[PDB]
Structure formats: structure tokens, C-alpha cells
């Protein structure tokens, strides 16, 4: 079976290198041509680099050039892309893909670069409900992620247990560098002193888990 | 060569027929291609060579060419047509993609639920206060979220974030959050979110060491 399998990706410092895979099973790789095509969170397509079935001739996007390199081999079956000098606008999931009646039929599944001076697990802090967050017979809860880096942070709540209602937002980019994200959760005003509601959040690259049990806020008077 | 792709976002109906152009900056012959693409899925080959369906893709899609002028069109467009769509020119040796065209379904307008979320005392140890203004499920995307500190318009130091459509009301949340120092939150009184969206305005405050 045809089978293009991705692998090599992962964090990696600026001005640095890593080595993305796109191993081609089925067919020859030297028979086709072979491109790679990345995608920042949340924005389009963008090509990078191709490479030619006869005398591996290359050619790259102007934004690439000299700075990363597209190679193969054919005892492998499997095209890499080495990334040197790596940017932060290089931050994104990285596609194999295979040339096919002037366009691309194939696809890897893609792997994720993601460019990072240091790790940062994150904070969380509730975001509790009361009577500025009750209309309709609604209380909106939630949970600020705040100052991580790199992504992703995922949010559950109650282990998967609480799924209507929820909403987990994009991540953002603070002006400190340092990402932030929320997860809110709308639910009936009577059930708030009949459930207990705590979010799960998952940062994998510092190998943080939190939980924190969001209550309504106390008042002091 | 800059594939320019119109229009950036749509929303229809199921059965609606619908129709994305793509216009090449310089002649690319007929060396163009239409992907769609489903969140964290990688894209799909619908049509090749402009006009030729790709083998297997549903026969509703169609492409076509006049000039530089390129166009995608879904004669009856079913749910599973939800998504993204991005033109190729695969002209010479550098690709271009065009910018997207999302397809989002049409519903009846929504005002959004507003709730306001003052900083936790946790958080103000690390010296930061945070102000969470939250927009609830409402249609279509555009609002505008304006912060008021002691009745001081704030700018410059308010980020927002965006859902996609929910997968069951079609509806859209957005968040909105104020980033303050301890101090300069410690110092003023009167927080509020003012909410504009269609042709309604709701205004939600609190005031620091309130409930
Ligand atoms: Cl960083
Ligand atoms: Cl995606
Ligand atoms: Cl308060």
C-alpha cells in the first residue's frame, strides 16, 4: 500500500536544525516528484520544496532558500527535509506530499516543528463564576492557562465526564512571548451546588498535568 | 506569481450552490489544482488541471477557467462540504497557494450571553491581573469587545480569541482578556466589558473587592 509516514519533528532551538521524514512505501519516490508544504497554526498553505524524480534536481520557496535542504534516497524510499537555521516563523506542521496530474494526490499525515527558546509550564486560574457571570439561568465557569510556552495545552473538564456547553479557545500569543489560553464551560445556575467542575489541563512538553476545582467566588462581605 | 482567492469567507445553506474563484497574478496556463481541507486533517485533492475531477471526489465539485480566472463550485452543497478550500498553480517550478475560502453554514442571528470574570487572588501574587470578558454563542463572527478601566477606554493591553463554529448551534464564542499590573489593577475600581454586536450593546462591570 502507498504509504507516506512522517517522522523527525518536534521542539528545536532558533538558529538550529532538525531533519523531518517522509518515508514513501508502494511506490518508487524516484518516480514522482516529491514536495513538502507546511502550515502555521491557523494559517494557509504554504509550500516549501520540491525535488525531481531524474537527477534530483531541487528547487525551494524564496522565504526557504539556502536555509533549509530537501533530499533523498531511494534504499530508504524516504525524502528529508533538513532544516537549518531554523525561525520561528517556521513553527508549524510540516506535509509530504507526492506530485501527481500537475497537482499533489498523497499526503503524510504531518509532523509538528515547533521552534522554542525554553519550555514554560503554565499557570491556571480559575475563572469563577458568580453573580457577574449568571444571565438566563446560566453560570459561565472556566479556566485561564496562562504564560506556557510552547502549545499545545489541552483542556478537558471533568475528565471528559463535562463535554456540552464547553468551549476551549485558540491559544494566543502574549507580547511576552509566553502563550495563553482559556477554556470556559456555560451550565445550568442551579447545578453549581450540585456538581463540582474542574478542569484538566495537559502540558505535555513540561510534563505538567493541573487540575483545579473552579468554585464560586466567596464573598468577603 | 500570487494566487489571489476570493472571497475569504461565505456561509450558505445545505443545497445551496456555491462558487470560490481564484485569479492568477500572471498566466499558469491551466496548471491548477482545489484542495479542501477538515481541521487537523491534511488536504484533499478535489480537482486537477482546473476543470478534470479527481477520481473518487463527489461529482458536484467542478472547476473551470477563463483567462486567469479560476472557480470552484458545489452545485448542492451537502454538510460533509463544510471546510476550507485552497487553489494550486503548479506552473514552471515555484507553487502558490491562494489564501482560503472558508465555507461556514448560515443560521439565524444571535446576540451573545456576556459574563464578566474578575482576576483570581491567586493570580495577583505574580503581580499580573488578568479580566476575562466572554462572548457566548451568538451569530454571525463580527463584535467588537471594548475594555473600560475607572471609566478609561483601554487599548493596547486586551488580546481575543475565537471558536470555529460549533459543530451543533453553528454559533460562534469569542473571549476577550485584559492584561493589567497588580498595581494598576489595585489602584482603579470599576471593571467593565462592553459588548457591541448586531443591534445590540450590553455593557457587564464589576467593581474590585466586590460580591
Ligand atoms: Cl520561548
Ligand atoms: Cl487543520
Ligand atoms: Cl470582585
Known amino acids: 500500500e502507498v504509504q507516506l509516514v512522517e517522522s523527525g519533528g518536534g521542539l528545536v532551538q532558533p538558529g538550529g536544525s532538525l531533519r523531518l521524514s517522509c518515508a514513501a512505501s508502494?511506490?518508487?519516490?524516484?518516480?514522482?516528484?516529491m514536495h513538502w508544504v507546511r502550515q502555521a497554526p491557523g494559517k494557509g498553505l504554504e509550500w516549501v520544496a520540491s525535488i525531481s524524480p531524474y537527477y534530483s534536481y531541487t528547487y525551494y520557496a524564496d522565504s526557504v532558500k539556502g536555509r533549509f535542504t530537501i533530499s533523498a534516497d531511494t534504499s530508504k524510499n524516504t525524502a528529508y527535509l533538513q532544516m537549518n537555521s531554523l525561525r520561528a516563523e517556521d513553527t508549524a506542521v510540516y506535509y509530504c506530499?507526492?506530485?501527481?496530474?500537475?497537482?499533489?494526490?498523497?499526503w503524510g499525515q504531518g509532523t509538528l516543528v515547533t521552534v522554542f527558546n525554553q519550555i514554560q509550564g503554565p499557570s491556571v486560574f480559575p475563572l469563577a463564576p458568580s453573580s457577574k457571570s449568571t444571565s438566563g439561568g446560566t453560570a459561565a465557569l472556566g479556566c485561564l492557562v496562562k504564560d506556557y510556552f510552547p502549545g499545545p495545552v489541552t483542556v478537558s473538564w471533568n475528565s471528559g465526564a463535562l463535554t456540552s456547553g464547553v468551549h476551549t479557545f485558540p491559544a494566543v500569543l502574549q507580547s511576552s512571548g509566553l502563550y495563553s489560553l482559556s477554556s470556559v464551560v456555560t451550565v445550568p445556575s442551579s447545578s453549581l451546588g450540585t456538581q463540582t467542575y474542574i478542569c484538566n489541563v495537559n502540558h505535555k512538553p513540561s510534563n505538567t498535568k493541573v487540575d483545579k476545582k473552579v468554585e464560586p467566588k466567596s464573598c468577603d462581605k | 506569481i500570487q494566487m489571489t482567492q476570493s472571497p475569504s469567507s461565505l456561509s450558505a445553506s445545505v443545497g445551496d450552490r456555491v462558487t470560490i474563484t481564484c485569479r492568477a497574478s500572471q498566466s499558469v496556463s491551466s496548471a491548477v489544482a482545489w484542495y479542501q481541507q477538515k481541521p487537523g486533517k491534511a488536504p484533499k485533492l478535489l480537482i486537477y488541471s482546473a476543470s478534470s475531477l479527481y477520481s473518487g471526489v463527489p461529482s458536484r465539485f467542478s472547476g473551470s477557467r477563463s483567462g486567469t480566472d479560476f472557480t470552484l463550485t458545489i452545485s448542492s452543497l451537502q454538510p460533509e462540504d463544510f471546510a476550507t478550500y485552497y487553489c494550486?498553480?503548479?506552473?514552471?517550478?515555484?507553487?502558490?497557494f491562494g489564501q482560503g475560502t472558508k465555507v461556514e453554514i448560515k443560521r439565524t442571528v444571535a446576540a451573545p450571553s456576556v459574563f464578566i470574570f474578575p482576576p483570581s487572588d491567586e493570580q495577583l501574587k505574580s503581580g499580573t491581573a488578568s479580566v476575562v470578558c466572554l462572548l457566548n454563542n451568538f451569530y454571525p463572527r463580527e463584535a467588537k469587545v471594548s475594555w473600560y478601566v475607572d471609566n478609561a477606554l483601554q487599548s493596547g493591553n486586551s488580546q481575543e480569541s475565537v471558536t470555529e463554529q460549533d459543530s451543533k448551534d453553528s454559533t460562534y464564542s469569542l473571549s476577550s482578556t485584559l492584561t493589567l499590573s497588580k498595581a494598576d489593577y489595585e489602584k482603579h475600581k470599576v471593571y467593565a466589558c462592553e459588548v457591541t454586536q448586531g443591534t445590540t450593546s450590553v455593557t457587564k462591570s464589576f467593581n474590585r473587592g466586590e460580591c
Open positions: 494550486q498553480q503548479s506552473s514552471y517550478s515555484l507553487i502558490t
Open positions: 508502494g511506490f518508487n519516490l524516484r518516480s514522482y516528484y
Open positions: 506530499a507526492r506530485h501527481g496530474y500537475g497537482a499533489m494526490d498523497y
